Write an enzyme that holds these catalytic residues in place. Structure first.
Site, short mmCIF file in Angstrom:
data_model
loop_
_atom_site.label_atom_id
_atom_site.label_comp_id
_atom_site.label_asym_id
_atom_site.label_seq_id
_atom_site.Cartn_x
_atom_site.Cartn_y
_atom_site.Cartn_z
N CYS D 90 -94.09 35.97 34.53
CA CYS D 90 -93.62 35.67 34.07
C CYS D 90 -94.28 35.31 32.34
O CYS D 90 -92.93 35.20 31.82
CB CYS D 90 -92.96 34.45 34.53
SG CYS D 90 -92.61 34.49 35.49
N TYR D 183 -77.71 22.62 33.31
CA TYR D 183 -76.74 23.93 33.58
C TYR D 183 -75.36 23.48 32.16
O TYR D 183 -74.93 23.52 31.55
CB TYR D 183 -75.61 24.18 35.17
CG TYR D 183 -76.20 24.86 35.96
CD1 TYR D 183 -75.72 26.61 36.19
CD2 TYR D 183 -77.50 24.53 36.98
CE1 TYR D 183 -76.69 27.32 36.69
CE2 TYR D 183 -77.55 26.21 37.63
CZ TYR D 183 -77.48 27.15 37.86
OH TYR D 183 -77.62 27.88 38.76
N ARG D 222 -71.70 30.51 37.43
CA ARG D 222 -72.10 30.50 38.79
C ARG D 222 -72.49 29.22 39.10
O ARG D 222 -74.31 29.60 39.51
CB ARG D 222 -72.40 32.07 39.05
CG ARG D 222 -72.69 33.01 38.01
CD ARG D 222 -73.06 34.22 38.74
NE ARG D 222 -73.16 35.71 38.87
CZ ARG D 222 -72.44 36.56 39.39
NH1 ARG D 222 -73.72 36.77 40.54
NH2 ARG D 222 -72.66 37.41 38.81
N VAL D 223 -71.87 27.88 39.06
CA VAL D 223 -72.50 26.88 39.77
C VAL D 223 -71.61 25.77 40.66
O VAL D 223 -70.40 26.11 39.60
CB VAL D 223 -73.14 26.29 38.42
CG1 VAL D 223 -72.78 25.50 37.18
CG2 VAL D 223 -74.12 24.76 38.81
N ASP D 224 -71.74 25.07 41.03
CA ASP D 224 -70.16 24.10 42.06
C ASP D 224 -71.08 22.83 42.12
O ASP D 224 -72.50 22.64 42.72
CB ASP D 224 -70.06 25.05 43.23
CG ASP D 224 -69.02 23.62 43.45
OD1 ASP D 224 -69.09 22.76 43.38
OD2 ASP D 224 -68.29 24.05 44.48
N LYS D 227 -71.91 21.18 45.35
CA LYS D 227 -72.52 21.56 46.26
C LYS D 227 -74.24 21.38 45.47
O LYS D 227 -74.03 22.30 46.99
CB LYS D 227 -72.04 23.49 46.22
CG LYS D 227 -70.88 23.97 47.29
CD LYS D 227 -71.09 25.83 46.90
CE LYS D 227 -71.98 26.20 48.02
NZ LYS D 227 -71.45 27.84 48.57
N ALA D 244 -81.48 27.48 46.00
CA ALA D 244 -81.31 28.17 45.20
C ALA D 244 -80.00 28.39 43.49
O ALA D 244 -80.61 28.53 42.30
CB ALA D 244 -80.11 29.25 45.56
N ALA D 245 -79.78 26.57 43.91
CA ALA D 245 -79.20 26.06 42.66
C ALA D 245 -80.75 26.17 41.47
O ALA D 245 -80.26 25.82 40.21
CB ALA D 245 -78.72 24.83 42.85
N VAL D 345 -83.43 28.08 34.40
CA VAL D 345 -83.36 27.53 36.18
C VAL D 345 -81.23 27.99 36.03
O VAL D 345 -80.37 28.44 36.85
CB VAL D 345 -82.64 25.72 36.08
CG1 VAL D 345 -81.82 25.27 36.94
CG2 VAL D 345 -83.97 25.49 37.08
N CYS D 377 -94.71 29.75 32.85
CA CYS D 377 -96.30 29.28 33.51
C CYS D 377 -95.79 31.29 34.42
O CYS D 377 -95.07 31.84 33.91
CB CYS D 377 -95.61 28.45 35.07
SG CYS D 377 -94.28 28.80 35.47
C1 LIG Z 1 -83.82 31.66 45.18
C2 LIG Z 1 -83.41 32.55 45.66
C3 LIG Z 1 -83.67 33.59 47.08
C4 LIG Z 1 -81.91 33.31 45.93
O1 LIG Z 1 -81.57 33.03 46.91
P1 LIG Z 1 -80.10 33.56 47.98
O2 LIG Z 1 -80.47 32.01 48.91
O3 LIG Z 1 -80.23 35.12 48.52
O4 LIG Z 1 -78.70 32.59 47.05
P2 LIG Z 1 -77.70 32.81 47.18
O5 LIG Z 1 -77.16 33.08 45.88
O6 LIG Z 1 -77.32 33.53 48.64
O7 LIG Z 1 -77.17 31.27 47.26
C5 LIG Z 1 -76.97 30.69 48.65
C6 LIG Z 1 -76.40 29.15 48.53
O8 LIG Z 1 -76.26 28.50 47.20
C7 LIG Z 1 -75.23 28.99 46.96
N1 LIG Z 1 -75.68 27.98 45.36
C8 LIG Z 1 -76.93 29.01 44.26
N2 LIG Z 1 -76.78 28.88 43.41
C9 LIG Z 1 -75.65 27.63 43.25
C10 LIG Z 1 -75.67 26.80 41.69
N3 LIG Z 1 -76.08 26.73 40.65
N4 LIG Z 1 -74.51 25.91 42.28
C11 LIG Z 1 -74.31 25.48 43.20
N5 LIG Z 1 -74.05 26.05 44.67
C12 LIG Z 1 -75.42 27.52 44.66
C13 LIG Z 1 -74.23 29.49 47.06
O9 LIG Z 1 -72.80 29.79 46.66
C14 LIG Z 1 -74.65 29.83 48.69
O10 LIG Z 1 -74.34 29.24 49.33
P3 LIG Z 1 -73.21 30.26 50.59
O11 LIG Z 1 -74.91 29.78 51.76
O12 LIG Z 1 -72.10 28.64 51.03
O13 LIG Z 1 -73.15 31.01 50.20
C15 LIG Z 1 -84.00 33.32 44.56
O14 LIG Z 1 -83.00 33.80 43.11
C16 LIG Z 1 -85.30 33.80 43.49
O15 LIG Z 1 -86.09 34.49 44.43
N6 LIG Z 1 -85.29 32.57 42.85
C17 LIG Z 1 -85.99 32.23 42.15
C18 LIG Z 1 -87.02 33.80 40.96
C19 LIG Z 1 -88.53 32.94 40.97
O16 LIG Z 1 -88.93 32.94 41.57
N7 LIG Z 1 -88.60 33.46 40.07
C20 LIG Z 1 -90.04 33.46 39.06
C21 LIG Z 1 -90.90 31.96 39.43
S1 LIG Z 1 -92.53 32.05 39.02
K LIG Z 2 -80.20 28.62 39.78
#
Ligand SMILES: CC(C)(COP(=O)(O)OP(=O)(O)OC[C@H]1O[C@@H](n2cnc3c(N)ncnc32)[C@H](O)[C@@H]1OP(=O)(O)O)[C@@H](O)C(=O)NCCC(=O)NCCS
Ligand SMILES: [K+]
Ligand SMILES: CC(C)(COP(=O)(O)OP(=O)(O)OC[C@H]1O[C@@H](n2cnc3c(N)ncnc32)[C@H](O)[C@@H]1OP(=O)(O)O)[C@@H](O)C(=O)NCCC(=O)NCCS
Ligand SMILES: CC(C)(COP(=O)(O)OP(=O)(O)OC[C@H]1O[C@@H](n2cnc3c(N)ncnc32)[C@H](O)[C@@H]1OP(=O)(O)O)[C@@H](O)C(=O)NCCC(=O)NCCS
Ligand SMILES: CC(C)(COP(=O)(O)OP(=O)(O)OC[C@H]1O[C@@H](n2cnc3c(N)ncnc32)[C@H](O)[C@@H]1OP(=O)(O)O)[C@@H](O)C(=O)NCCC(=O)NCCS
Ligand SMILES: [Cl-]
Ligand SMILES: [Cl-]
Ligand SMILES: [Cl-]
Ligand SMILES: [Cl-]
Ligand SMILES: [K+]
Ligand SMILES: [K+]
Ligand SMILES: [K+]
Lengths: 393, 393, 391, 391
Positions: D90, D183, D222-224, D227, D244-245, D345, D377
């Site tokens: 990164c 956000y 893409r946020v709520d 939630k 994920a959020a 984020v 990082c």
């Molecule tokens: C976190 C990660 C695994 C994604 O997880 P995921 O479970 O496949 O993500 P999803 O899009 O299916 O989100 C899961 C849930 O969270 C919710 N959600 C995600 N972002 C949200 C937000 N900003 N606000 C509200 N809700 C949110 C989704 O609506 C979903 O809800 P649902 O189960 O009712 O549908 C992936 O984005 C990731 O690996 N991120 C880190 C990247 C990283 O490590 N980068 C390098 C840093 S060192």
């Molecule tokens: K996020």
């Protein structure tokens, strides 16, 4: 001299609607569609599930479906663990061949009640990779629909190109095929609107975690047409002087059909009223490339065997593998096109390859009027065809 | 009333050697081995190829073999293009079920001469990738041998694990299983060296460009054994108190078998001396995990149907899916061990799954003395079994 | 501050393994660890003295996160050591040394490790993310796709070589004679013990198997001179010139150098092998990469006011026999001074490693006071060059 | 010679697209070309003045040969421009700027482009070379295998973040509050037009469909908020905190800066945006990457002799909300000065790009004379930091 055999009757014939490729029924495995059709057929027969002694199901593309597809479909329909099961592969003829083979068991008195039909989920057919070491430079993983389903082994060309070959010989041109195709869509729509599939088709509900339910209550394919575009389409299998297009060929589809078959005596014991009597059936084979005309010879065999004439047949079901196939059959047999695929066919309703042979027998069963003779025929890759004569009761 | 059926005779029974996994026959597809056996059977029968009216081949793992495996096998054997073909899948029972279904056609008088048998090239069974969108985090490529061939759908465990469950229930211990296994290898070696497969097995020439031709003239698997190692092996299907090892289970293999079947009338017409009469057959099914005991019920059905007693059987062929299976069957039927699998079986000779049900029937045909009854039985994944009774002519 | 002088204190490498050959069980990063550990040992310094590491590595797919970090931690260097992985295609191993030198010149670090690593044996196949197309799915070979195909022309590196063979009139027989000479020189050098300080042996350990010690380059023994003129032209079937024999091969290996400022070398009282005099990158039309080293070499000479005659030893990476011949033709230099102990045509070409190897070889082979010039072409039309002087 | 002064003359980026979102049809290199061409246009210099280019790019598999070269030639830069692709996970996009600054400081070039690019949407799956194992195999996702899995601990970056959350007592609710804050900041900055000199629009053209003009970041919408407190802790089932959020997302984008010496800026009549003052890399235990940026930042401050209070704005890459909070806590800085206009984020994290984006953002957002400090990082236990002053 001539064996004395048990009389075989069809007591019910039921199918799922046919779904389009990657379409309405694509989340459901072939075996699940099988279970749905088998359960429906037993309900429509009005018999106990325990009365079904054995099951045969046509299913052409079995790769990745798991062990014993027919067993999966049967146990999936709540039938007893004691029910033996066999899965049948005669390419596009599978669904019919299943019925024929079940009929033969019944005739021998080896079983008194059986379920027979076909199932196919072309949406879920996988890709394959050879066992062994990856060659330097990469590899294309082959599509089983194309490799196992649609490529003639000996000529190394698609079923569509074999159809083009027949088009040439019998002088069956683009316009005639396009006219047949439009007619098939027209008839399919008419039949569905007139409610001609009321007792035949059972709905399937597609349940997905989270999202709302979808009820699929009719065939999906016949509404996917544009009559204006039909004559504008490019020939998919042959660029030079081609005739076959996406519109006038069958499509790739998902669906299952099942029939409850029993001896005449069995139907009396169980106090159920049969729909039709299975009279005769036959298989014929020709040069692999010439499969479109094999249904002619198969049909003739059945007529000769029973000593009937083409005029005695009220209703023909000649599977619409390509519009070309039906026209080739109408031509060579010299039969009244008004008596052929009257409520549509595979060109417009779709062609889940392992189920179509069962569907077309199931449809005669319902559409025939008391006393009438119905003849179904279906070609298959490799140069084969199956045919079956039934008589409505 | 019971139907009056034609009598069915076996006129010839021929097979390829059985090759080890990735072994001596691994370059040949299943369909090619099919052609060799089919050609072998017809030549041995002393009839014209054109007399064969129809063919059924058992074949469990059809993925990637190309369109219509049985048609390929038949046309590859130089049989007429007029010959209809159907490929049969009852898992390990496929080779026997093919013979059964062909017999029912003959009994009905629908054909007078047929070829039936089984074929499998486990060496060439491919891997699969699902159609659709690639899931985040990885794509699985499944092994079709494991997925379609060896995994019980319902319990989600290997066939070997189901076997362990019966070992548990019937208290059949590791030592007994190993002893049966050693016995199987011993019998196979004895039979091979005595020249007992002299009319049964036809040799296969493997040709590779630039390489010296290899003639495979005998079964490969039975020489691949070390009796001292047998008791030492780990139980590969279970951690806690296991019994099934690589040594006492069947192996993965390549091979084909084919039989020429005809009516008594056709054998007379063609002036050929029939080898055996096919008397009866049955399919049984039980709980999927309990497939090892399915052959008990199928054999029992056959004996009860013909009105024979277990003591009346001169030779038993109980397919050696696992040493366990044979022992469980001997235990429940209370039959003479000395009359079961006399010249070896699948534990030592190997188990090309679609072929084995045909092989064992073909073996009884050659091994029985005039007038003797032979009973062949075979379990299949899903919880089934087929059994057949023949009498040597 | 004023710019610091950079010296090479040690230069070490693994043997080069053939494709799917003697080192094929070891990932690139493990080869990297071996080379880095060896270089530190040869330098006679504590591992803690190494401040930062850069490794060339072209085909990083499936190696896991941060390949250079894996090499460095795998060599037991401190967790405090920052690491960066460098991709200038075949120039990667030299560009790592150049970029390390720049950091040292700025006074941003005083001791670094730089080199390159590749395990072409372990480079995977790829499948695209998305929906599987009807009719089949292609699994591409990353060696071919990322390593060896020119993006713009949609041809193999070997076809770019053919293009230069046409324009400069460099024939099949000339390329074959060069290749035979490379194999000859590699064997002579190995027999003479010329790699005793440069190469360190690798032990390949398999459970249930006896250890195998790989102590010499594998590729140079894989040759049949009588067959050389008979080979098919693999990149151009008709009227071609490039063959399997006269092209570099696919290979596994790693090389690492310990670099320091003059001040750090003195502080640590190490004896430096060579000083880094100058370096440069050049780039040309993508298809013309075989001639890019000519411009790169010219830049370094002009930078320091030296003439081609002042160079004792030239290392012009043998990506193809054609490349070396093109360089000799354009520069008009003495062939007896070029790739004197063999090169990539006969020793093999782990692509991310070769640019470091050739700098390391000059460091060992040059006599005191002599200048050595190493140049190396890369896919896309690039080249890097470096001039060193033996101390 | 003495070290040359380095200035940033322009800094431009694509919008950031969501995973399989609005920019997913474009390869990383094409996003690269767009950013590079934009940066050069904004700089107002002839494109021929750009002498060399470095681009950060973490997940290079399947992108074809020499990704940076493809980006540069695709931007219409001359074939004479040498190119190198940089991988510090990164930190890549920042490390590219640092390395290019070192070349300029040495006087080895006078004008360069440096930045980063990533199309996570187009990162492929891999199959190992060799014979297929009986029983099948799982083709690995390179995002997971190369991007997000720590080699040594064999756990996801997200699980490393969990370790720091536990050690520093940074709770689920605090992480969620930070994420909501990001956000909120991103949306407010977009609505205030704060990216008008920074982001250039991307037209996505599909033959047979109408053009789509992507003019802003996709992810922050893409946020709520309701939630956020309901989500599962996706890296750790028991006592987890990361969701994920509150974690960064997977994204597509590219950023590019034009860098010059102060002499070259004078020569070309360019008014630079900012001066590059100092930069550093730090590394710690792989699992402890969240805290590496604290050390990297402290190094830069100590080098130049500034205190935390002298910094007007901080860009601490939002790899996870946890990372920013750990940094704020350990450095004891005013949260109102950190990631003022959102971050990864909420804007997303095309991993090779983000390190350049955050430097470019400071270049635009700082007021005359103010110092900005950016840090980021990286998997493996690293961080890079950079100090700039607005001119
Ligand atoms: C976190 C990660 C695994 C994604 O997880 P995921 O479970 O496949 O993500 P999803 O899009 O299916 O989100 C899961 C849930 O969270 C919710 N959600 C995600 N972002 C949200 C937000 N900003 N606000 C509200 N809700 C949110 C989704 O609506 C979903 O809800 P649902 O189960 O009712 O549908 C992936 O984005 C990731 O690996 N991120 C880190 C990247 C990283 O490590 N980068 C390098 C840093 S060192
Ligand atoms: K996020
Ligand atoms: C023919 C086949 C390859 C489909 O071809 P395809 O080109 O992928 O089909 P598409 O959905 O892309 O249709 C192609 C074109 O025809 C049009 N089209 C398809 N069906 C149509 C219809 N019923 N009416 C009007 N237009 C139609 C589409 O709109 C499309 O037009 P476009 O090029 O302007 O977008 C496939 O269905 C097939 O192989 N069928 C034969 C099955 C078979 O052989 N079964 C066994 C029998 S032996
Ligand atoms: C059992 C099976 C899983 C293979 O297991 P495997 O462990 O990969 O077999 P291997 O060849 O690796 O043999 C393992 C060991 O047993 C030994 N072994 C196998 N057969 C032996 C024999 N007949 N005599 C002596 N030793 C033997 C081998 O030497 C090997 O020893 P090693 O660990 O020192 O190398 C597979 O063949 C199988 O699934 N069989 C059952 C097939 C089936 O279910 N068919 C359908 C029936 S319903
Ligand atoms: C050239 C290349 C494609 C290999 O081609 P290949 O045809 O698969 O090579 P092979 O190993 O199968 O050799 C082919 C034939 O040449 C022969 N051969 C190879 N090297 C030989 C040598 N040094 N002497 C004599 N014969 C030789 C082989 O014996 C074989 O003979 P055969 O056909 O009678 O069996 C591959 O090594 C390559 O791509 N090299 C270039 C790498 C590159 O471009 N690197 C970056 C530079 S910019
Ligand atoms: Cl047929
Ligand atoms: Cl069953
Ligand atoms: Cl690091
Ligand atoms: Cl370049
Ligand atoms: K159609
Ligand atoms: K065995
Ligand atoms: K060579």
């Amino acid at each position: 001299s001539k064996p004395t055999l048990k009389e075989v009757v069809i007591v019910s014939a039921t199918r799922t609607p046919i779904g389009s490729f990657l379409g309405s029924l694509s989340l459901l495995p072939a075996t699940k569609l099988g279970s749905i059709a088998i359960q429906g057929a037993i309900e429509k027969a009005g018999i106990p599930k325990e009365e079904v002694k054995e099951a045969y199901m046509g299913n052409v593309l079995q790769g990745g479906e798991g062990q014993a597809p027919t067993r999966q479909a049967v146990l999936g329909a709540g039938l007893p663990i004691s029910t033996p099961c066999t899965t049948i592969n005669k390419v596009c003829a599978s669904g019919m061949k299943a019925i024929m083979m079940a009929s033969q068991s019944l005739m021998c008195g080896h079983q008194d009640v059986m379920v027979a039909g076909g199932m196919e989920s072309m949406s879920n057919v996988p890709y394959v990779m050879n066992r062994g070491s990856t060659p330097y430079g990469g590899v294309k993983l082959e599509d089983l629909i194309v490799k196992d389903g649609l490529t003639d082994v000996y000529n190394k060309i698609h079923m569509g190109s074999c159809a083009e070959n027949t088009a040439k010989k019998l002088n069956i041109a683009r316009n005639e095929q396009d006219a047949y195709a439009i007619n098939s869509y027209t008839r399919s729509k008419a039949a569905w609107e007139a409610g001609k599939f009321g007792n035949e088709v059972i709905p399937v509900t597609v349940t997905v975690k989270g999202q709302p339910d979808v009820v699929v209550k009719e065939d999906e394919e016949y509404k996917r047409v544009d009559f204006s575009k039909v004559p504008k389409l490019k020939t998919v299998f042959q660029k030079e002087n081609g005739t076959v297009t996406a519109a006038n060929a069958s499509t790739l589809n998902d669906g299952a059909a099942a029939l409850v078959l029993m001896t005449a005596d069995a139907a009396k014991r169980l106090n159920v009223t049969p729909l039709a009597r299975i009279v005769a059936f036959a298989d014929a084979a020709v040069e692999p490339i010439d499969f479109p005309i094999a249904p002619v010879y198969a049909a003739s065999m059945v007529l000769k065997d029973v000593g009937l004439k083409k005029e005695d047949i009220a209703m023909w079901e000649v599977n619409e593998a390509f519009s070309l196939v039906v026209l080739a059959n109408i031509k060579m047999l010299e039969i009244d096109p008004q008596k052929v695929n009257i409520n549509g066919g595979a060109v417009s309703l779709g062609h889940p390859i392992g189920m179509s042979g069962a569907r077309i027998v199931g449809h005669l069963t319902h559409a025939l009027k008391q006393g009438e003779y119905g003849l179904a025929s279906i070609c298959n890759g490799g140069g084969g065809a199956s045919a079956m004569l039934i008589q409505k009761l």
